Amino acid sequence: GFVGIRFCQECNNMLYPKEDKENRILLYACRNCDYQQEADNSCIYVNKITHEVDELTQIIADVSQDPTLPRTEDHPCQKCGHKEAVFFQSHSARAEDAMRLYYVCTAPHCGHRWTE
């Protein structure tokens, strides 16, 4: 998982994590406000050293209407079942391994994306 920034409710500033040294529980207090809200995630911070990220989260469906981009008829969609699909390599710079191809259904109101 991760942890987001949860903003103060009074000042809308950033809440820092702080241990309740009395009840022994994680809080989220503010710097400017005196706003103590009770944590739930028990996490301060994460850091994916692997830099493993799923590209399908970053691939946006609008890419299908890109004329610049190669179209296959060799991998059909799964939700609808369209034949047409654009495909491309991960445009993200973290790709020295990923010449893997990401496919997008070329059919409006679907935008189903998958990797084979």
Partner 1 sequence: SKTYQDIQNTIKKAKQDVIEVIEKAHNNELEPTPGNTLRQTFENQVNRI
Partner 2 sequence: GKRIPFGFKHRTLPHFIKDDYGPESRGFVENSYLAGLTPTEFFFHAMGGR
Partner 3 sequence: FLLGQSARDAERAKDILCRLEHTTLRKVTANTAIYYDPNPQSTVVAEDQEWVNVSPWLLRVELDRKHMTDRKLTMEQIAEKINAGFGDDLNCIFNDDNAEKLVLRIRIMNDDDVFLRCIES
Can you give the binding site for Zn ion, defined by CB under 5 A?
8, 10-11, 13, 30, 33, 35, 77, 80, 82, 105, 107, 110, 112
The yes or no reply on residue 48 touching partner 3 (CB under 8 A) is yes
The β-bridge partners of 29 are 16
Side chain identity, residue 71:
R
**Other beta carbons less than 10 A from residue 32's beta carbon:** 11
The β-bridge partners of 105 are 85
**Other beta carbons less than 10 A from residue 3's beta carbon:** 13
CA separation, residue 111 to residues 46, 61, 79, 98 (Å): 31, 5, 10, 22
User: From the list 27, 101, 111, 114, which residue makes contact with partner 1 (rule: CB under 8 A)?
Assistant: 101
Please choose, out of 3-11, 40-48, 54-62, 89-97, the segment that lies near partner 1 by the rule CB under 8 A.
89-97
The yes or no reply on residue 43 touching partner 3 (CB under 8 A) is yes
User: From the list 37, 78, 89, 92, which residue makes contact with partner 2 (rule: CB under 8 A)?
Assistant: 89
Nearest-approach distance from CB 116 to partner 1, in angstroms: 7
d(CA 70, CA 63): 11
Question: Binding residues for partner 3, per CB under 8 A?
Answer: 17-19, 24-26, 39, 42-50
Question: Binding residues for partner 1, per CB under 8 A?
Answer: 95-97, 99-101, 116
